[PDB]
Symmetry: C5
């Protein structure tokens, strides 16, 4: 990965050293002052870009953090307002749990058919999978469970609207996660930075060899490691729903959500 290019940068230094003997046999000079200017501007641009990536990562963590909050209070409101409708308690929790797993499959571009059948009846699974957005359909079914208790006079419009806002909050999370996934800036994330940091890292030893007869690979790999490590960190934080090392553990976050919702409805795993 990054060590593979760190090794290549060492070979370019070796190329720049053994070919430094034939430098004067050509009209080439490479001072370090121009590469200090270029390198500093790249560092500034990497500093701002890396900052924008971390902002996405925090927003993704926050959006998933709201899933746990909204689904907790929706179950809490269901208990305090309607403590005797335990049938709706189980059915709504199964929709809320399915919403979390289906959102994970949505952001991961995987098949939710396994987790859907585990939690919901088959007639519901076919209705949910047949939608252009199954997570949106799950919120609709959860709203029908809330809304059917309203038609039965079991809850007022006020206490209905109280629970409605929780579904409204989940919808904002779904729209927010959908936004973060389908929002890549144009190819400037690679056209500008992926090329330049690479091209600057491999051309740097050819300019550093004039000052340092043999210390070039040490200094060049140190600068190349500093720049490449900062740039590669930005790529990981840019896509927080992937399977990288520094990406959101979505499977663990969904297990915590199902554990919470079952702990509130008196069910032991």
């Amino acid at each position: 990965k990054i060590i593979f290019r760190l090794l290549l940068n060492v070979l370019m230094s070796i190329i720049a050293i053994i070919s430094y003997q034939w430098y004067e046999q050509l009209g080439i000079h490479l001072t370090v002052a121009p590469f200090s200017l270029l390198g500093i501007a790249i560092a500034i641009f990497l500093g701002f870009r890396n900052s924008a990536s971390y902002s996405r990562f925090v927003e993704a963590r926050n959006l998933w953090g709201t899933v746990l909050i909204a689904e907790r209070t929706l179950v809490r409101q269901l208990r305090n307002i309607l403590p005797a409708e335990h049938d709706a308690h189980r059915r709504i929790v199964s929709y809320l749990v399915a919403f979390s797993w289906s959102l994970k499959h949505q952001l991961r571009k995987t098949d939710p058919t396994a987790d859907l059948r585990r939690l919901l009846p088959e007639e519901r699974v076919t209705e949910i999978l047949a939608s252009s957005m199954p997570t949106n359909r799950i919120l609709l079914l959860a709203g029908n469970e809330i809304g059917q208790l309203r038609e039965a006079g079991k809850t007022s419009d006020i206490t209905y609207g109280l629970m409605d806002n929780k579904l409204d909050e989940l919808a904002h999370v779904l729209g927010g996660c959908e936004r973060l996934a389908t929002t890549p800036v144009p190819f400037a994330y690679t056209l500008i930075l992926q090329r330049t940091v690479y091209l600057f890292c491999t051309l740097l030893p050819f300019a550093l060899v004039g000052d340092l007869h043999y210390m070039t690979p040490f200094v060049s790999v140190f600068i190349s490691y500093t720049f490449l490590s900062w740039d590669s960190l930005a790529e990981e934080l840019e896509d927080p729903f992937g399977t990288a090392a520094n990406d959101l553990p979505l499977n663990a976050m969904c297990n915590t959500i199902e554990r919470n919702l079952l702990d509130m409805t008196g069910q032991h795993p």
Copy 2:
């Protein structure tokens, strides 16, 4: 942008063959002053690009709310009034019409073809007669919500629940209008774009003393780094502007229309 890189290579070749006659005229160009100028320009480019990225992000959040507000409004209709299927299809029309009309407004394109597809020509003429057609569609959508209230089909509580979604839409409309007008740097972005253009063309004359024949290669690498970062802030400053990328705006209006058709049992086929 490639044209200005060929101009830069041509200026480097000029600075090489002309490097003879600088002697004794007293015209010496070092690298330290141009290194100070370049680092300063890079700082301003970084701050400018930061404000541009923020405008691009706010544009995404506004259109994201369009998808959210229209989904929850249709969901509230099915959960509260599951039997009023005629009111369903009417309100779904205006919400889909609101999305396309808003896109055509930001892109200064004609919304007539999209409006005729979704709404009857009586309402299409009323919408196209108003100077603010996107606001007119919101008013018509409210008249459907208000008619369900006067008909005694919705309480004042549930009317307020749906009314809040039209408020989320109206906040988006005004937000996109505020972004659509030319931004806060009143034609001052043309100065910083030319400051970069002049710095990249005066650079090979400063570098040729230290680099000689390596000037066309190092000067074009620096010019490309500066010209690419500037042109990026140009694309971000104008998310709805002329000659922008219509893919995400078209995909969003298509996504919401598909969603609402699915939520109203219209899309799958019998």
Copy 3:
């Protein structure tokens, strides 16, 4: 602006440094570029963060006025969908909302709102507004009465009353925001430090450049000075958003768009 004046004074400083270049080593005064690159970089950093504060504040002023259009649009829409038979109460409330916009413009510009208020309101209400030490705030209080009368007359439930009252709370957050922006600018210490250092650094620059540049001193010292001055002047023209300059907010055109919007919704 005066930016083109200080560019010419910078040209004169380049000429002084070019011809006085001789007596430097005699008096012992040398000026290299290296310490000026340190100072010029720290000034560019501080210039960047300062312009960031000026940018964010100009955006906030644009956001506030954008809310006036939104809240008045929806408050009129709600009156239509809820009380379509009350056409008389429509025009009474729309006139107050239009007056609120114009009075907020005249307040932020310190101009006379008496002319616009008499165009939209009866003289009894104009006297009531202009008698208050905070006339714009009194306009909201009168708009709250038209909403309140509809509630006490039984034509509006407390629920739908609360839906309309919230729009007046949005207008109340705009009034306080504009007042806060108008009385609290970016601290003077920022514009005091940078104005001094940028100007002193631009004039001393040809002295520290002539040793390396010679006859290229004027064509480079101006280029560098034009970069710092244009950036410092960008904040000069972004710190007065409520004014009447070319780069200020078009509050007159904004107040016209609002009055044009609210009359399109009420069929006038």
Copy 4:
């Protein structure tokens, strides 16, 4: 200024640097500008972030105080709109809201609230307020009882009670926000050591600049010193917006505006 003493103390070090430059090679002390350019730019970067964080505390503090004027403006308006006859209730609540502002100012300034409290409230309540742990929270609870007494008396429905109740919640969020900015500043390691670093870099710069600028050392080294020192001491001021510095918030003027607003003539 707080810098005017340290600026002159730096000019003394520049004289110590110029007299002892030929004696560098006799004592074996070569000094260049390149290392101090690295150290200076790193401090300028850290100063830019530090100063930016301090201005954020200033903006939030000004915004928190702006909400007080907005929330108390509308709370009086809703009383005047929903219960236009309860002028005795209007008066009692307006006095509590004005006492809330002066009490919060004295809380953030650590001054005595007994003065402004007796100016606005009966003595039976000045004792109940001064005897509480948090007196500002005590004023809010008394303002809440007035809204609650109107509700238990049937004069106010649960819907219009919640409208006014939310305005007091907005005031409680301002109290918690000001307590936050006050009772926990920036970490002291920020200000403690960053002050050390800028001073030492300013008083060692002429020893490294004298070689390049043999006699221009005092000027260029005080120009750089003024730039770095004016930025640090300004960030030091903005960290404490509720303080009494020159660039802090005018809390006494703001409380005057709130009072002049609410008791405009009678009941706003």
Copy 5:
């Protein structure tokens, strides 16, 4: 912290660079200052952004605990204004709220919350709370049962039940926030990369500075090392706001202030 040991190692790395500068020619190692300025400045830029992210994380944790005090204050105030007679619910709800604060404290600190919980609640509720793997969430559910009973008993309307329910929603968002901060830290690649690069840069620097500074190497080197290491440790000590150091949030002091505030609003 342990920064003093890293400075003395740098003083040893400088004398090793001085006693070994002779064999630079024989071993064929050249080291100029120009590349170490590009590296150091880039390290400084990344340090400035990283330190900036750590400060905002500390501030978010500070704001979360600020919301606890605000929400618990207004929930007690709303009870005294809506149900001034129902004191059986006053004492139970206040005890549940104070238990929420202490449970959250021990949760972020990973300490035993039994002592504080039994000091506030009966055993049949202390056992149920500690029997759950989410004890702090269970305290909110029990607090909801109190508000829910008052509504079912006909003592509050659904409107007033909704007004109080939105305070438990506010407390639920704080719990999710603190958990999200405690579990999900600043991505470890920041401390991974920057600590490697800063430490290696401070040891290699005297070998590049000794060619220009000679015997002045240890002073300028340990100065630059002190600046970089202090800024790096400052970001490290801001990344853990729920720690036990004096540098972190005084969670014990905040929970004492909350328990005093709620017991004061109920006259205890």
